[PDB]
Design an enzyme around this catalytic site. Sequence first.
Site, PDB file in Angstrom:
ATOM      1  N   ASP A 137       0.824  -1.209   0.000  1.00 12.59           N
ATOM      2  CA  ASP A 137       0.000   0.000   0.000  1.00 12.59           C
ATOM      3  C   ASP A 137       0.870   1.275   0.000  1.00 12.59           C
ATOM      4  O   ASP A 137       0.491   2.291   0.584  1.00 12.59           O
ATOM      5  CB  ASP A 137      -0.956  -0.061   1.221  1.00 12.59           C
ATOM      6  CG  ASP A 137      -2.282   0.684   1.107  1.00 12.59           C
ATOM      7  OD1 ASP A 137      -2.528   1.294   0.073  1.00 12.59           O
ATOM      8  OD2 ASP A 137      -3.027   0.723   2.099  1.00 12.59           O
ATOM      9  N   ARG A 141      -0.295   9.155  -0.014  1.00 17.47           N
ATOM     10  CA  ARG A 141      -1.336   9.243   1.029  1.00 17.47           C
ATOM     11  C   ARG A 141      -1.012   8.433   2.300  1.00 17.47           C
ATOM     12  O   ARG A 141      -1.584   8.730   3.340  1.00 17.47           O
ATOM     13  CB  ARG A 141      -2.722   8.853   0.468  1.00 17.47           C
ATOM     14  CG  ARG A 141      -2.817   7.391   0.014  1.00 17.47           C
ATOM     15  CD  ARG A 141      -4.170   7.149  -0.617  1.00 17.47           C
ATOM     16  NE  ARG A 141      -4.194   5.908  -1.386  1.00 17.47           N
ATOM     17  CZ  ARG A 141      -5.141   5.577  -2.264  1.00 17.47           C
ATOM     18  NH1 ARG A 141      -6.065   6.460  -2.622  1.00 17.47           N
ATOM     19  NH2 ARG A 141      -5.106   4.403  -2.872  1.00 17.47           N
ATOM     20  N   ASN A 142      -0.087   7.451   2.217  1.00 21.46           N
ATOM     21  CA  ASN A 142       0.323   6.580   3.343  1.00 21.46           C
ATOM     22  C   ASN A 142       1.715   6.915   3.872  1.00 21.46           C
ATOM     23  O   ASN A 142       2.308   6.132   4.615  1.00 21.46           O
ATOM     24  CB  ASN A 142       0.174   5.077   2.970  1.00 21.46           C
ATOM     25  CG  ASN A 142      -1.266   4.764   2.624  1.00 21.46           C
ATOM     26  OD1 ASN A 142      -2.178   5.437   3.084  1.00 21.46           O
ATOM     27  ND2 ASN A 142      -1.516   3.827   1.734  1.00 21.46           N
ATOM     28  N   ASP A 155       0.816   3.174   7.789  1.00 21.27           N
ATOM     29  CA  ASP A 155      -0.305   2.335   7.290  1.00 21.27           C
ATOM     30  C   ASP A 155       0.116   0.902   6.949  1.00 21.27           C
ATOM     31  O   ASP A 155       0.181   0.523   5.781  1.00 21.27           O
ATOM     32  CB  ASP A 155      -1.017   3.014   6.097  1.00 21.27           C
ATOM     33  CG  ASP A 155      -2.524   2.798   6.022  1.00 21.27           C
ATOM     34  OD1 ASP A 155      -2.965   1.622   6.058  1.00 21.27           O
ATOM     35  OD2 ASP A 155      -3.260   3.801   5.855  1.00 21.27           O
TER      36      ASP A 155
END
Length: 278
Positions: A137, A141-142, A155
């Site tokens: 992932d 955004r992480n 994350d």
Amino acid sequence: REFAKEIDVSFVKIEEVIGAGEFGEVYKGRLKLPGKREIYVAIKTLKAGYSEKQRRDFLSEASIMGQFDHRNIIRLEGVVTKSRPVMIITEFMENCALDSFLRQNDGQFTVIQLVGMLRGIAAGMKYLSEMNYVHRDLAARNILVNSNLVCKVSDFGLSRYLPTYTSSLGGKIPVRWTAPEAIAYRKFTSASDVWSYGIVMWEVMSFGERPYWDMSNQDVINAIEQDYRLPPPMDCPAALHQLMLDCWQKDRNSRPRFAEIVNTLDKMIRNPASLKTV
């Protein structure tokens, strides 16, 4: 399961909500360990009325996190499992998610500042991959940012110990960041994380633009299959775009390892001529 970083509930002071997580909100707070200066922390909580499965999945992130001790991996300060509510406590990151930070600060940073952010991310990923983990992932955004532009991988929900991880699902993966072989076969390796890293490089050099813009997930799968690759962002050095193209090689074995990526970025930082041709 016992947690080395288990803390008594009285040590934490919850303040304002700073975000939303899969299982509950993320708050800003204060952590006061006996005989140590109080610090600002971020607190991940699990909403009341959670199932035992949700509690297990929530705490499995804390177990993964507790195995890491690197500058570019979000630091676990404490875990609350033996008292209510259950919490995951990390170092506080003033500038939040990397993608939204860059969009809110478009053109505020030099090429070398952006390369420094990328070097930190690659350093955290080298550490994670050498611990035999696949993130699955990796996206801007992480990634979390502090006040001095230090970027940290966060994350860990989708993270798995490897070397290939073969998943049972397909509706959880973030398509435009995922390597084509991981989409087609559910086969995740450190090389598929390298593909994601190349996408993060593009996100950073474009000040948080959405990879493939408005193209649907289906369009993206199709374009990658037809050998399309994202173009270099506005005023991007050629050497940095070349590194992105290296991360996006169809054959996963032709992709550089995270150790080579760190080395390439360290050389660019020391050789200004390399970041000169666009």
